[PDB]
Amino acid sequence: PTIAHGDGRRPSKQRTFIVVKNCHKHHISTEMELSMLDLEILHSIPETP
Amino acid sequence: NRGLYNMVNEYSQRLGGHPATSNTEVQFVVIAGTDVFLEQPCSFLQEAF
């Protein structure tokens, strides 16, 4: 909005501001090691205590 | 020289006459006086600090 005046100035009209904001995506990745040995142990079946 | 009360009314009511402008590199004289407003007590009693 805008005040009306009494003196002689160039009166700014009914302004309207369109403003936009864009999103930011964030990626995160860490690497964990797992050996082949314990994985191949996991893929088997146990029979001995 | 119109009187003390006349000078006090002349100080507060309007500009005493031809002050500096606003937000410009070099000081001009403001002529329209649309959106500037100031008082100048140096011009009121005619001395400088």
CA B16 – CA B39 distance, rounded (Å)? 8
From residue B29, alpha-carbon distances to A11, A24, A27, B18, B20 in Å are 22, 50, 59, 6, 5
The distance of A8 to chain B (nearest Cα, Å) reads 7
Query: Which residue of B lies nearest to A11 if distances are taken between CA atoms?
Result: B34
Q: Which residues of A touch B35 (CB under 8 A)?
A: 9
8 Å CB contact between B16 and B43: yes
From residue B44, alpha-carbon distances to A34, B4, B9, B12 in Å are 87, 11, 11, 10
Q: What is the three-class DSSP state of A42?
A: helix
CA B32 – CA A10 distance, rounded (Å)? 12
8 Å CB contact between A8 and B34: yes
Reported as half-sphere exposure (CB side, CA atoms, 13 A), residue B42 has a value of: 6
Helix (H), strand (E) at residue A37: helix A36-42
Query: Which residue of B lies nearest to A7 if distances are taken between CA atoms?
Result: B34
8 Å CB contact between B45 and B27: no
For every residue of B7-49, DSSP letters joined together read HHHHHHHS-SS--B-SS-SS--B-SS-SS-----HHHHHT---
